[PDB]
Amino acid sequence: QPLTSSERIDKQIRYILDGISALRKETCNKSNLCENLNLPKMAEKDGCFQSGFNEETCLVKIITGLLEFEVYLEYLQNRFESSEEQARAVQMSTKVLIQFLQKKAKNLDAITTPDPTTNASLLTKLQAQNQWLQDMTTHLILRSFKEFLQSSLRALRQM
């Protein structure tokens, strides 16, 4: 029995969570404090929770949110000299996931693309913080991205 489109998405999310787990271990090892910021987050109106569950509004939110996360994953790869390959694997893994999800939504279309030139300003603002605030930013991106993916996986199984 070959993987269905749903099973492939489900596996790809668990695969990226295993990667975030591995990239957290390298960025925490490297941090000298380990071992404002508006990151995508599910709310009840997005239709991804059991209360107010709405399959179509939910799938649009998952895709919109992953697209909004890409500049943060570029921030991680641009920073992690040592964890270079691992951070790039997470970016490219997230790109394949977005492609699987866009095939599922091919019936819906539209979707809010983030503005490129706002994302290039965000990037510069993030890279000009002192090392403390950049280590905090890294932690908050990895935590928030993990929580988005777990919420996405729960919603996708309820479809």
Residue numbers in the entry: 16 to 50, 60 to 183
Give sentences copied directly from the paper behind this entry:
We also attempted to crystallize a synthetic IL‐6 glycoform and started with IL‐61. The crystallization of an IL‐6 glycoform with a full‐length N‐glycan (data not shown) was not successful. The structure of IL‐61 (GlcNAc) did not resolve the flexible loop beyond Glu 50 (Ser 51‐Asn 59) but refinement to 2.0 Å showed low electron density for the GlcNAc residue indicating connectivity at the side chain amide. Notably, in both structures the unstructured loop region ends at Asn 60. In segment B the N‐terminal cysteine was protected by a mixed disulfide and the native methionine at position 48 was replaced with a norleucine, thus preventing undesired oxidation. The three segments were connected by sequential native chemical ligation followed by two‐step refolding. The glycoforms were characterized by LC‐MS, HR‐MS, SDS‐PAGE and CD‐spectroscopy indicating that the correct fold was attained and the formation of the disulfides was complete. The native helical fold of the set of IL‐6 glycoforms was independent of the glycan and only the overall intensity of the spectra varied to a small extent. The resulting hIL‐6 glycoproteins were of high‐purity and were properly folded according to CD‐spectroscopy, LC‐MS, HR‐MS and X‐ray crystallography (one structure). Despite the variations in the sugar part the activity of the individual glycoforms was nearly identical in the cellular assays indicating that the binding to the IL‐6 receptor and the formation of the signal‐transducing receptor complex should not be significantly affected by the various N‐glycan structures.
